[PDB]
Amino acid sequence: AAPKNRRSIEVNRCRRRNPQKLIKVKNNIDVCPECGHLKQKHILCGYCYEKVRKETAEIRRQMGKQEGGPFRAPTTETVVLYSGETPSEQDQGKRIIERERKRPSWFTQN
Amino acid sequence: HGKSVTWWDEHLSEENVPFVKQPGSSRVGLIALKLGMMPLWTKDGQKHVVTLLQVQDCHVLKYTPKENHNGRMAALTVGGKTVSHFHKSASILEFYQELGLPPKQKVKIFNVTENAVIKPGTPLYAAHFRPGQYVDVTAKTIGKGF
Amino acid sequence: SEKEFVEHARKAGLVIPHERLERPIHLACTAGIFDAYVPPEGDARISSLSKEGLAQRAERLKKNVASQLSIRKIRESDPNFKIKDFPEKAKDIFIEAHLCLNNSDHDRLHTLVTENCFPDMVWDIRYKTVRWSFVESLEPPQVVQVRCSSLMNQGNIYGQVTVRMHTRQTLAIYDRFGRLMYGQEDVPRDVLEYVVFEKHLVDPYGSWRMHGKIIPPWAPPKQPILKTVMIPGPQLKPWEEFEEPQ
Amino acid sequence: ISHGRVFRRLGLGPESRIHLLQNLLTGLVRHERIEASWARVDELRGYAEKLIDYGKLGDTNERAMRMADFWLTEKDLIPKLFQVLAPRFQGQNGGYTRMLQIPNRNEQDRAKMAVIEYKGNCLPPLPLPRRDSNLTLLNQLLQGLRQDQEASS
Amino acid sequence: SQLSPTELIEMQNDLFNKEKNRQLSLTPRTEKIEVKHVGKTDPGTVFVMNKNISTPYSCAMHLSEWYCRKSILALVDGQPWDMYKPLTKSCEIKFLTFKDDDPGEVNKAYWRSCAMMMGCVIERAFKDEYVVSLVRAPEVPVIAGAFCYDVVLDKRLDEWMPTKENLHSFTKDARALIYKDLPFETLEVEAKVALEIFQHNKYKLDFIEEKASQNPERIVKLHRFGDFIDVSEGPLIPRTSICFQYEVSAVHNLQTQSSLVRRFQGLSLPVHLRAHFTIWNKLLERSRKMVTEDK
Amino acid sequence: ISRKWEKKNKIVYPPQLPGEPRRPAEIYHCRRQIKYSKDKMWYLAKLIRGMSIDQALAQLEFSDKKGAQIIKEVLLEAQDMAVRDHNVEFRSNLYVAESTSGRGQYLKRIRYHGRGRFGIMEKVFCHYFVKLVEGPPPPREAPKTAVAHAREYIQELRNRTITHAL
Ligand SMILES: [Mg+2]
Ligand SMILES: [Mg+2]
Ligand SMILES: [Mg+2]
Ligand SMILES: [Mg+2]
Ligand SMILES: [Mg+2]
Ligand SMILES: [Zn+2]
Structure with a gap:
């Protein structure tokens, strides 16, 4: 179908400035207690998850460095230690992931 | 003041969440829960189908007089099954706090003659209906959308 | 349909066009100050004594040798030059x-101060409004020292006279929105400067110009600003942890 | 009408949906923590929960062996499951996995993201939403009520 | 003496502005003090404040409005200060909200703030023909259900007991006090000046004597919001509008051989930590009971 | 073209006499030739009108539009301009007084349809303008109460005169 008359700018303003087509405000914005950045209340902090993701990428790269095959997987459990740490007696019998940087404040020993 | 939104489970800690968790007259009708369907058989051999309506929590809530509601018959307010305190509205919890009962799901109005009035806050049971009678059933049907 | 945008402005400097000037750039004044005068550290206490400091x-x-050799060079390049009458001209040029x-x-300031001096006194202050007044001079100005160097590429001589003045000034800097920013108008604050002046000697016109401004290393700090200032810390990428030096 | 439907439409059909969720489950078993779209991870959570229950049935169970053979498409992960994941999950009944909502992707799609992981993985912990401490005002005021209730019994 | 309630408030207001102008004239020039930020979120930030003019609220305005809305107390070294109390020396600063893992000082400051607020309600909610003598704000910790203020009332008033309508009237003009926005101001006042401020109220003069006995410099802390001047040791909250829910729960009698005091007890909850209606009613049911802790 | 928003920052007012109220700062900033669309840009400009700069950046952080990042960068650089080049202490004490979007220079292309036909395809470029004023944000106007409506309508009746009278 073809339009019969040109829509005027008054009707166009009424259509395009109507509150259902406007961007609604978000009231769930909160400050992160750890880093002081911004996050939503039901969503993890992007800054903290970027830290966790980069450390996870470093761990995964260094454990892929130790194993030279794509089809070889560990039979036993994996533990990770940083510089200046030794494997515990309960951690023996598990494969060892050594990293040169110091252990983070957020990451515990366990 | 750009006040942020809040709920009941925001500021509560794990030690306190289970602490918080711990001839021409007409009769009064009921609010029940449709459980399911069953077969039934009669002594002449025929088979009918019965729908199961379970009353769980039925209480009369408030009484509206004859001259203030319709001018012919008074109004009795009946609530349904019991729901949570935290997801209802402030005025609803205030009026149920004055009434004395936990929050109900659905609230309905019954047209009742003045000789059948019931004092508010009174529970009701399925023995309100006797075996062998005819009833009218009102509900929101199965919504099939657009 | 086939049309594109133009005028993407960029500044690209290369060695070849800067070498291929047919006419070299002529500097009327040199860039750096040749030697910085080191004053005795008790000049805040000798300045209150008349006969000690002047003598x-x-x-x-x-008693200086190189300073007197440069002064002899200035009289030999240009006659009718007097050391004694010079501090009055320096004070008048300052005022x-x-x-x-x-x-x-800006045109009279182009006649007075030099090319190295001009952006230092224009760049930050031009968007602001200032009102400056000269009220007194507690000590008459001292010609401290005179230097020269002969650039042999063209035979150019630049005579610099470092002059010390103890000056009473009333300085106020107003914001472009009109509000007061730096200092009051009615306070006669005593200040000391070691201003180096310069004159090109080969130039037949050769106006006496203000070259540089020297503050003593032990000088008192300037008056505090009215506006409150935050210096933020280092911006941190996520896989870098903060370290606190002691 | 979508009444009583628990499986959402994904991929190019039911077979493509099963194959994509198989790929996601293989990646989750191999790496113990993966991020994807919210709906795919939400569908993946039930498969990852029942895969641990099938691994609990033992190495000698033929039905579980063929289930793991089909679902774990990389063949090294079946000994990895039966000798890592099943012995590690013994006590708890259904608390195998964690699902969290990641913020939107920095690509132009702005899709809604979720991360899925197993308990006890050898990875740095995610920034979990921590509750308020018990020294907070409302918690202390409610501990006062708890103390008066304990004093009333 | 013959002093109307308008003229007496005018008298403490005039003397407070005089003493404030004396402290303003005590600092002739603006001096730059270097404050380090030792907060966990933003370390290494260097602030350059004015001596005895700039406040930690003005410090937080340099960072963000998020710190201005959330921050309630400020630790300079190991001692908490008010958010509007001016800084004195070059130091290090940290901010505490309700949200932090150790919010105890903030909870105490909020608690004493509501005690002073209820004092403001009571000392203006009665007739001029009777006399209202405010005693003090006894510090009971947050584990109790209600904050309490001790009031000495008239000798002919001791018979009747205030009812639910009176308590909701106290709640109503308390919320009217919340609705208008008044900052909290803190000033260090010499003991004889505090005696001149408090004038007739002998319990207040005794409280100033007791608090100045513990300090060798004979100083006390005076806090002012709106037009009321009240004494409280330690810090308070910055703003009036931090309170969301306020209620004057219950009153109680306490008799000594020399005096009969009324203990006014109430419950409040902030904008940050507002609770559900049911939780608020349970806490209000708790707060009706007696609270007895002085030492 | 026209460039006046950049020129508006060069206006120097005369100094204020003592005793006068302190004049608030006004910071004019703009960014030209943004790839985003004019009306879609205008929606984001309408979102942040009258809000303070911190909550404006808070909303534009989590807005999913492409121009949200552009206005976020513009607001940060405008705040940077305000904190150094102007004498604005309390960098969080700014609000967005005026934010609007104009249209830039458009490029024409051919959009092919079929049956040998074609349509002209308009490459859309837009400008963004922002004005930051030092001071607290103005309070949002409440709707008129029934007392206010009664006051105006009784005043309207009291302003009646007898028409075509003498
Ligand atoms: Mg439906
Ligand atoms: Mg699809
Ligand atoms: Mg063709
Ligand atoms: Mg056309
Ligand atoms: Mg077109
Ligand atoms: Zn964070």
Whole structure:
């Protein structure tokens, strides 16, 4: 179908400035207690998850460095230690992931 | 003041969440829960189908007089099954706090003659209906959308 | 349909066009100051004594060898030059340059101060409004020292006279929105400067110009600003942890 | 009408949906923590929960062996499951996995993201939403009520 | 003496502005003090404040409005200060909200703030023909259900007991006090000046004597919001509008051989930590009971 | 083209006499030739009108539009301009007084349809303008109460005169 008359700018303003087509405000914005950045209340902090993701990428790269095959997987459990740490007696019998940087404040020993 | 939104489970800690968790007259009708369907058989051999309506929590809530509601018959307010305190509205919890009962799901109005009035806050049971009678059933049907 | 945008402005400097100038750039004044005068550290206490400081400045005037050689070079290049009448001209050039800075007239300031001096006194202050007044001079100015160097590429001689002045000034800097920013108008604050002046000697016109401004290393700090200032810390990428030095 | 439907439409059909969720489950078993779209991870959570229950049935169970053979498409992960994941999950009944909502992707799609992981993995912990401490005002005021209730019994 | 309630408030207001102008004239020049930020979120930030003019609220305005809305107390070294109390020396600063793992000082400051607020309600909610003598704000910790203020009332008033309508009237003009926005101001006042401020109220003069006995410099802390001047040791909250829910729960009698005091007890909850209606009613049911802790 | 928003920052007012109220700062900033669309840009400009700069950046952080990042960068650089080049202490004490979007220079292309036909395809470029004023944000106007409506309508009746009278 073809339009019969040109829509005027008054009707166009009424259509395009109507509150259902406007961007609604978000009231769930909160400050992160750890880093002081911004996050939503039901969503993890992007800054903290970027830290966790980069450390996870470093761990995964260094454990892929130790194993030279794509089809070889560990039979036993994996533990990770940083510089200046030794494997515990309960951690023996598990494969060892050594990293040169110091252990983070957020990451515990366990 | 750009006040942020809040709920009941925001500021509560794990030690306190289970602490918080711990001839021409007409009769009064009921609010029940449709459980399911069953077969039934009669002594002449025929088979009918019965729908199961379970009353769980039925209480009369408030009484509206004859001259203030319709001018012919008074109004009795009946609530349904019991729901949570935290997801209802402030005025609803205030009026149920004055009434004395936990929050109900659905609230309905019954047209009742003045000789059948019931004092508010009174529970009701399925023995309100006797075996062998005819009833009218009102509900929101199965919504099939657009 | 086939049409594209133009005018993407960029500044690209290369060695070849800067070498291929048919006419070299002529600098009317040199860039750096040749030697920085180191004053005795008790000059805040000798300045309150009349006969000690004047005679001691005169003794450093008359006992220096290279300074007197440069002064002899200045009289030999240009006659009718006097050391004694020079501090009056230096004080008048200082007063007129600061008054032209008050009036925001740039052509008279081009005649007075030099190319190295001009952006340092224009760059931050031009978007602001200032009112400067000269009220007193507690001590008459001292010609501290005179230097020259002969650039043999063209035979150019630049005569620099470092002059010390103890000056009473009333300085106010106003914001472009009109509000007061730096200092009051009615306070006669005592200040000391070691201003180096310069004159090109080969130039037949060769106006006496203000070259540089020297503050003593032990000088008192300037008056505090009215506006409150935050210095933020280092911006941190996520896989870098903060370290606190001691 | 979508009444009583628990499986959402994904991929190019039911077979493509099963194959994509198989790929996601293989990646989750191999790496113990993966991020994807919210709906795919939400569908993946039930498969990852029942895969641990099938691994609990033992190495000698033929039905579980063929289930793991089909679902774990990389063949090294079946000994990895039966000798890592099943012995590690013994006590708890259904608390195998964690699902969290990641913020939107920095690509132009702005899709809604979720991360899925197993308990006890050898990875740095995610920034979990921590509750308020018990020294907070409302918690202390409610501990006062708890103390008066304990004093009333 | 013959002093109307308008003229007496005018008298403490005039003397407070005089003493404030004396402290303003005590600092002739603006001096730059270097404050380090030792907060966990933003370390290494260097602030350059004015001596005895700039406040930690003005410090937080340099960072963000998030710190201005959330921050309630400020630790300079190991001692908490008010958010509007001016800084004195070059130091290090940290901010505490309700949200932090150790919010105890903030909870105490909020608690004493509501005690002073209820004092403001009571000392203006009665007739001029009777006399209202405010005693003090006894510090019971947050584990109790209600904050309490001790009031000495008239000798002919001791018979009747205030009812639910009176308590909701106290709640109503308390919320009217919340609705208008008044900052909290803190000033260090010499003991004889505090005696001149408090004038007739002998319990207040005794409280100033007791608090100045513990300090060798004979100083006390005076806090002012709106037009009421009240004494409280330690810090308070910055703003009036931090309170969301306020209620004057219950009153109680306490008799000594020399005096009969009324203990006014109430419950409040902030904008940050507002609770559900049911939780608020349970806490209000708790707060009706007696609270007895002085030492 | 026209460039006046950049020129508006060069206006120097005369100094204020003592005793006068302190004049608030006004910071004019703009960014030209943004790839985003004019009306879609206008929606984001309408979102942040009258809000303070911190909550404006808070909303534009989590807005999913492409121009949200552009206005976020513009607001940060405008705040940076305000904190150094102007004498604005309390960098969080700014609000967005005026934010609007104009249209830039458009490029024409051919959009092919079929049956040998074609349509002209308009490459859309837009400008963004922002004005930051030092001071607290103005309070949002409440709707008129029934007392206010009664006051105006009784005043309207009291302003009645007898028409075509003498
Ligand atoms: Mg439906
Ligand atoms: Mg699809
Ligand atoms: Mg063709
Ligand atoms: Mg056309
Ligand atoms: Mg077109
Ligand atoms: Zn974070």
